[PDB]
Design a protein around this ligand. Sequence first.
Ligand SMILES: COCCN[C@@H](N)NCCCCN
Length: 275
Amino acid sequence: AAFGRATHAVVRALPESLGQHALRSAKGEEVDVARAERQHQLYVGVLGSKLGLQVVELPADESLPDCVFVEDVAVVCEETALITRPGAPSRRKEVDMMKEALEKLQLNIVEMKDENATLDGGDVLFTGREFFVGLSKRTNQRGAEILADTFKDYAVSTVPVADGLHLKSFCSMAGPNLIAIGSSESAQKALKIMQQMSDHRYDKLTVPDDIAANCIYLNIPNKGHVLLHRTPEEYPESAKVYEKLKDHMLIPVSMSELEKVDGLLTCCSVLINKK
Ligand SMILES: COCCN[C@@H](N)NCCCCN
């Protein structure tokens, strides 16, 4: 009932400098920055226009090429916001605008300040009853410690993440007590770690493409149990798996341009529930 409720979405415009200077783990086609802006506008359109969330759009900062990926700089649970200390040096000033937006939303703000701590919000899976935090190139144990202290109400457990991935590079919540999970060995080992550490186990939805396991679940009262998932023209066989959720309002949303710079669906928004 309560899980996935949101009233506000914080997003951030992307900068033109993204196409050229955004951190990129794997190299391939270049980014069509104009097209990426169109896909990002369609995505904000789903959140605000279609689903009715109050969207706070932060302006783009050319000096922060990754500023569109707001998920990495803030983790919000109930009324408290953890402003993170991103692993990547170039991203650290992205917290300034985030701090200001969340102040305006009157959230309890905690700023990660231990200079031995790093945490990327994309490494944080909040399941509704606990947190899993990936230990990765961007998030270390000290960062997980600070998250645990900030959200003392919830258990926090760490999961090793290999190869410059983030935890949510291959998983996300697809519904109450339901983890969407990739089929790779790494994704499957991560899940069994999470399952063994939890108080009690989660249901799972296995999708063939790891990247397609990153989706956005929203409880919009009197609209539906909404899932934004990658399109059938991006990942056809994963999209078909999501179709089995006959009780969900399924919304295909493309992220094909920003995926080139490791940008998935959860990365582009911070969802908040204001009562
Ligand atoms: C859900 O996370 C998937 C991986 N990317 C997230 N973490 N940040 C976006 C990439 C920023 C660097 N260009």
